[PDB]
Structure formats: structure tokens, C-alpha cells
Design a protein around this nucleic acid. Structure first.
Lengths: 94, 78, 100, 82, 95, 99, 81, 79
DNA sequence: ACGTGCCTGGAGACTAGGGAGTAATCCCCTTGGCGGTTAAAACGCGGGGGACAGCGCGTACGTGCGTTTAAGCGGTGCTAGAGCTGTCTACGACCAATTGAGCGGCCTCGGCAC
DNA sequence: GTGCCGAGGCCGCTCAATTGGTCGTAGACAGCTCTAGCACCGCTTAAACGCACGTACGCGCTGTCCCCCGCGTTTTAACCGCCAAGGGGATTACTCCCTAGTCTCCAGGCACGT
């Protein structure tokens, strides 16, 4: 029917990191698979974290703990910083 | 095609294996391409582990016992 | 009556990834009964950061090979030449990664 | 039906795969062992893919069946999601 | 006035069914509880995944059977499928 | 008025609790809906696997002139059966002895 | 507390190796084993402390350790209650 | 059940020393330490099984650090 | 690779309710100290088993070349089956009343260790 | 023959499983379309293959020396018991604020065209 994909958002992020570089369709497929894999890993870890504490709601605290459990080393610190920055900006923005 | 595994023999081998699980099965071309990609990756990784076992025995020639040792340490079913 | 101009949650958070689609995926996927307001924003920020890191290292690999486009070989090189991304994506097989 | 197609993976193909893995010299008894190992791996993957296909009431094995069968081994594969 | 649930009494009933004269220690009871719990989560998670793959919202005995085939090996899978089918048939035949 | 209550386990001829299994399936965030035969099937499978392990462990305990199953006997039963070892090989049994 | 990896004594490593089927042990094995154990324990304890911090707790429980081990692919039976 | 002594007090001091680099003023349930000790026992016994497999392959009976390193590399463990 | 229509998924506003945050209490379980006393570790020594380097042999592997084989490609046709839409019925969720299954505390004495 | 403690049996209560009725909708089934998997054929040419041959290397043997194991002795520090303190986990009660749900509106993203 109409398969939703992250190609346009990956292309926007690509034009922010490398404004003159393109990307082939097969590389866009690998990036889509990567984004889906990471989304399902983090969401699954957050869902397990909520159930361990007898909670019904997945909040940004479960996402942060999932990111700290899954990402290694230096990657976790910057991902956590980027997520906290986004949440703070979103909360300030009415 | 550097890691050339030929298409037709691999497709026939895939069809032969699937006959033992369900009769009159069809395959997409992309399913066979995924199987072939997985087989390539698995075999290259296993040959890397096999070459470490040969070097560890002070050899340069990989032998079936090296593959057996690598697959045992990996925990693969013999 | 007088609805203000609609502003995406992505633009409020300063993000490129869709916060609304991430929220819908979280709700649909039977991960929990309820989803907080900030969870999709946090998840989209993390996903965008990881995408930016991988695309930057793939662009560096493409530039080092003098090509103006990213191919799966450049993604494989980027993953396997970084210690953290190799730890995160070591068990993963990239189609055409080794060979082009 | 044709059978014994495991010979279809030829000795030069195994040599190419082994040289990409860093091997310099290959014993002549490696090829049959490699064919058996590949047969076992393929049997496991195809069994789980056919289970996924049978569940969905289908008669054709799709790329998503293979991806799901590989993932649950712990051998995630990128680039076949669409 | 509070409770935590476990499978100890049912494991004991099955143990008396199979070995009438044998007992079991509390440590072994904990091992059995952990085993039953672990298998339950494995099968339930596989069934949930199977339902999500096929865009279904209901987990049925077909999903459980497919999950058991995926997770259990060989004769264990064949005997477990036979037992589950027998139990479901007996359940649905009744009243 | 109503008829005498009969547990679903008795209806299916099982020792494991079908009603508890249904409650856990509904609580667990596995799907929006749970069919009627799914808890029965799951309880039957769990009962079968428990019976298999307890049979092997009772055999192992009998072979040691002991009338009571301890974690060592469970470990022996798991490691001496090929199907159980494939199913329960990556599992550590507390006080079971690492062989 | 600073030097506690030396509390895993050489006879203990000898016993563990004997239980794994080893007949003869080189004298350089003990430091390597202590380093390997330290790495393993660091990983497990880090994930357990993350679980504990998520729950607003100050005490690491056996369930935190069981969850940390479970997500390594190492499943520990007998501490769930 | 066939006693395989790792002494409780030094292992507890080791666990507390390791954990203080992640959080200060941490308490440990006693069953948490027992579970950690049981996991360490199992992990080390299985690693010595793999190490003995690697040593025999080289026509030796003495295990050496290189056997442990090869076993851990094949397993996929981080060096 | 860019412009354009439309249509479907996202955003805005409002309401109800229950999930979760916070305060208070209690009691239990973790931490620390001290003494003795004993098991486990540390240390030294002597001997011999095993690791490792050197050497010779013979065998099996890598390379090159002419021949054979069958894969790949393009074209054609057939027909099964996957994906989509529409209908309708059985099935599972939800609520309320009932009651027996199951859990905790107490009592007992058996299988093992001494 | 004696003593231990932990596992088995019994009873009260209480809460979760069962039964009955209702109803909305998920899915099973039929019909249709049109896509893509499979089969055949002829031609070409890339790749596999089979043989010869030289030499690198695997493997068996030998000799030396080093460094591990077993044993006896001394040390040291774990461990058990007893006591005390206090932190903090678990539970309960109250409140309020955050999220689901519904209806309306519109603007971003995708197929088509250039």
C-alpha cells in the first residue's frame, strides 16, 4: 500500500553533515534497516524497564536508561546529552 | 563479483534443502539473495576464526581440525 | 475557532526526525499502556544523533576514496573502522559491504 | 528432482572465501568439511524461514522470512527491509 | 495480609505424577520456578512477535504452536506440539 | 442461579493453572487480545516440559541412591540430555556444579 | 579498598581450572585470569548498577544482577525469589 | 554441592571496589553477591574448558595466556 | 532532479480519570567492631615432565595451461498466488456476583549427619 | 543409636478465577487483479577442471634445560558468634497533573509529470 520509511529524514541529516555528498538507494536501505533496528532495541529495553518497576508509562527516564544500557561508552554520553538537550528545548517551546 | 558464489547452483541447493520442510515451495529472488549474503558473511567469519586456530598451532595451512575447534569454541552444533 | 499555525513537535525540539511518527510507532507497538510526552522526543533525538554519526563517518570514508556518493562499502568501512560503532554493529551483516 | 547440489559450491569459491578471511594455504580436506558446515547453517536458517512462511499461510518464502530467521539466530542482516 | 505467586504446587503435582515417591528441595523448587518463568517469557515473546509480523492483534493457539516450533528443538518440539493440541482438543470438546 | 464452577485446567486435563497463565498473558503486554485456546496450549506445553525435566532429574537422583531432587540432579538431567542441553545450555544452575 | 583482585588466590584459580579439565597450568595464567575476571565483573556490575539507579534504590538486589546477566546472554536460575 | 571455594570476604571487597567507580555509597544485598559469585564461577569454568581445548590443539598439556586469549577472541569477548 | 495536487497522518483544544509523585512510618536487613581459632594460603625445595628449538624427509599444495562445462542472458509464455476489498459472524473484552483454590503460619517427625 | 532441621501436612481467610450476559469488531472467507516465479531454448564465453611439476611446509624425532607439582611448615586472615546502630525498602494515603480519547483542520510527503 504505502510503506513509511526514514529516507527523507536521513537525507536531511546527510545534507546537514555533508551538504555536497549524495547517497545511493542501497545505502539508504541499509540506513533504514539500521534506524529500525535501533528503534526496536531501545523500545524493547524501555518496555522491559517499565515492567520491572511495575509501571504503565514509558517516559524519557526509561528511554535514557535504555540508551545507557545499550549504547557503548562514549556513544551513550553523547546520545544522552542530545536527548536531554532536545527534551529541554521541547519543554521550553510552549 | 569478487566473492562470486554462482546463482543457479546456490538456488538449486536452497530448493533442495527446503524440500525436506515443505513441498511445492516458491522463493523470491530477494530471499535467495539474502540467503547468499548471509552464507558469505558466515563463511568469511568462520574462515577468520579457522585461520587464528591454524596460526596458534604454528601452521599456515588450515585443516579440518581448525574448523572443528573454531566451531566448538563458538558453540556451534558439531 | 482561531487555531494557531500548526508547529510540528520536531521543529519545537529542533530535530529532523519525525517526533509524531516515533510517537505513533511507540503507541502501536505494544511496548506499554501509556507513552509520555518526552519519550518520543528523546528517542528521535537519539536516533538522529546516531544517524548523523554514521553518515559523517561514511562521508569521510567516501571522501578518502575520492567518491562523491555513499555506497554500502563506505557504510561497512565506517562501522568497522570505529571502535564504538563496531561494538554496536559488529554482529550485523551489511549487504554488499565487503565487495561492492 | 535434482539432488546433491551442495557440490555446486565449488572448490574455487571456497578458496576465494578463505582468502578473503585471511587464509594463505588450504588443506585439500577443507572443502568437504566446509560444504557440510554450510549445509548445516543453511538448513537451520531455511527451517526457521519456512516456519515463518507456513505461519503466514503463504507458499512463497520472502526476504522478510529470511531476515526474521537470521535475526533470531543473532545474525542481523541490513538492506532487505524493503 | 499479602502474597507473591509461584508455580511450586503445580510442579509438585507434576512431580508426584511422574515420580510418586520422590521429593524435591526448596533450592530445586526455585530452579524449577525460574525455568518455568523463563520458558513462559520466551514463548510469549515469540508469539507476540509472530502476531506483530502478520498485523494481527490476537494471540491464539496457532501463534503458540508456531512459537513452540521455533523455540523448541526436534523431538521436544514435536512432543510439545502433540501435547498442546491434545489439551486444546480436550478443552474445546468439553461443554 | 449458576452451575458449579470448574477450573479450566480440569476441563483441559492439566495440572498447570490455565487461569493464571491467561492473566499473565493479558498483563504482559504481548498483544491487545488473547484467544481462548492460547493459555490452554501454553499451560500444556509448560506442563510437558516440567514433566520431562522432573522425570530426568528423578532418574538421576535414583541413580545416586537419593530419594530427593537437588540442583545437582537438575544440572545432570539438563546436561545429559541432548535436547535439554540444546534448550538449556546457556543457563547457569545455582549450586548445580559447572559439570 | 584498592588491591582486592589479589583476593582471588592462586589455589582458587587452580581449583577452577582443574574443574574445567586442565591438567597443567603455566605461572603466567593467574594474572591473566584475574584481569579477565575483573573485566567480566565490571561489565555485569555496571549493568546491575544501571538497573538499581533506574529504580531510585541504593541497594543492589539479586534481581538486578539476574537482569544484568540475562542481557549478556547468560541466564542464571535460582535467584528469582 | 561438590565445594569449589571462592572465599566470600575477598570477593565481596572486590565487588565493592569495582562498584564504587559507578556509584558511591552503594549497598549490596547478600543474594546479589551470591549471584555474582555463582556467575563468576560458571564463566571461569567455561573459559578454562575452552582454554584447555585450545591448549590441546597446539599439542600441549599446559595452558598458557595465549590459549586464554585465543579462546576469548573466538568467543568474541573484548580484549 | 524539481514542481504540483491531494490525501492521510499529525497537531490543537477540551475533558475525565487514574497513574504516579510525595510524605510518613516501621521494621528489617546491611554495615561495623572484637575476639579466637582454625582452615586456607604462602613459601621454600627438589626432581622430573614437558616445552621448545633444531633437523631431515617426503608429500601434498600452489601455479600455469589447454579443455570442458554449464552459468548467464535475452525473449516468450504460462499460471499460481500475493495483495486488496467487501460482508458478516463468531469471539474476546468488560462488568458484576459468587465461591473455591491457594498462601501463610503452625505442628510434626523423617532422611541425613554425627 | 542419637540429634538436627527442613520438608510435608492442616486450617482459616481472602482474593482471583469462574459464570452469565452484551456488544463491538477482528478476522475468516469469497472474489478479483495482475505481478512475478518458473520453465524452455539457443548462444556465447567465463569459469571450473583436470594434469604436470617443483618446492614449501607439516610432521616425526631428539636433546636440553626450565619451571610446574607435590609436600612439609609457618603465617595470616576468613569466619562465626554476639551486639549495636541506623539507613532505606516496602506499604499506605492523598492529591494533582499528565495522558488517552474525540472531533476538527491542514499541511507534509508521496505518485505523477516534466
Amino acid at each position: 500500500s504505502r510503506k513509511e520509511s526514514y529516507s527523507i529524514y536521513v537525507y536531511k541529516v546527510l545534507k546537514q553533515v555533508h551538504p555536497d555528498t549524495g547517497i545511493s538507494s542501497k545505502a539508504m536501505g541499509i540506513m533504514n534497516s539500521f534506524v529500525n533496528d535501533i528503534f526496536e532495541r531501545i523500545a524493547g529495553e524501555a518496555s522491559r524497564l517499565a515492567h520491572y518497576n511495575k509501571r504503565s508509562t514509558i517516559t524519557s527516564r526509561e528511554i535514557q536508561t535504555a540508551v545507557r544500557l545499550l549504547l557503548p561508552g562514549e556513544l551513550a554520553k553523547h546520545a544522552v546529552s542530545e536527548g536531554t538537550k532536545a527534551v529541554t528545548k521541547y519543554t521550553s517551546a510552549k | 563479483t569478487e566473492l562470486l558464489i554462482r546463482k543457479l547452483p546456490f538456488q538449486r541447493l536452497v530448493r533442495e534443502i527446503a524440500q525436506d520442510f515443505k513441498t511445492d515451495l516458491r522463493f523470491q529472488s530477494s530471499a535467495v539473495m539474502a540467503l547468499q549474503e548471509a552464507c558469505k558473511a558466515y563463511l568469511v567469519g568462520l574462515f577468520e576464526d579457522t585461520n587464528l586456530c591454524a596460526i596458534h598451532a604454528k601452521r599456515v595451512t588450515i585443516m579440518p581440525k581448525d574448523i572443528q575447534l573454531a566451531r566448538r569454541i563458538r558453540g556451534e552444533r558439531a | 475557532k482561531a487555531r494557531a499555525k500548526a508547529k510540528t513537535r520536531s521543529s519545537r525540539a529542533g530535530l529532523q526526525f519525525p517526533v509524531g511518527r516515533v510517537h505513533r510507532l511507540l503507541r502501536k507497538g505494544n511496548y506499554s499502556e501509556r507513552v509520555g510526552a518526552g519519550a518520543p522526543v528523546y528517542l528521535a533525538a537519539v536516533l538522529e544523533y546516531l544517524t548523523a554519526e554514521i553518515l559523517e563517518l561514511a562521508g569521510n570514508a567516501a571522501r578518502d576514496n575520492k567518491k562523491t556518493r555513499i555506497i554500502p562499502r563506505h557504510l561497512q568501512l565506517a562501522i568497522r573502522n570505529d571502535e564504538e560503532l563496531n561494538k554496536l554493529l559488529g554482529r550485523v551483516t551489511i549487504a554488499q559491504g565487503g565487495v561492492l | 528432482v535434482l539432488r546433491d547440489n551442495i557440490q555446486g559450491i565449488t572448490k574455487p569459491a571456497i578458496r576465494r572465501l578463505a582468502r578473503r578471511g585471511g587464509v594463505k594455504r588450504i588443506s585439500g580436506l577443507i572443502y568437504e568439511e566446509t560444504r557440510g558446515v554450510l549445509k548445516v547453517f543453511l538448513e537451520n536458517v531455511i527451517r526457521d524461514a519456512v516456519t515463518y512462511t507456513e505461519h503466514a499461510k503463504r507458499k512463497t518464502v520472502t526476504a522478510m522470512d529470511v531476515v526474521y530467521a537470521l535475526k533470531r539466530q543473532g545474525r542481523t542482516l541490513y538492506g532487505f527491509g524493503g
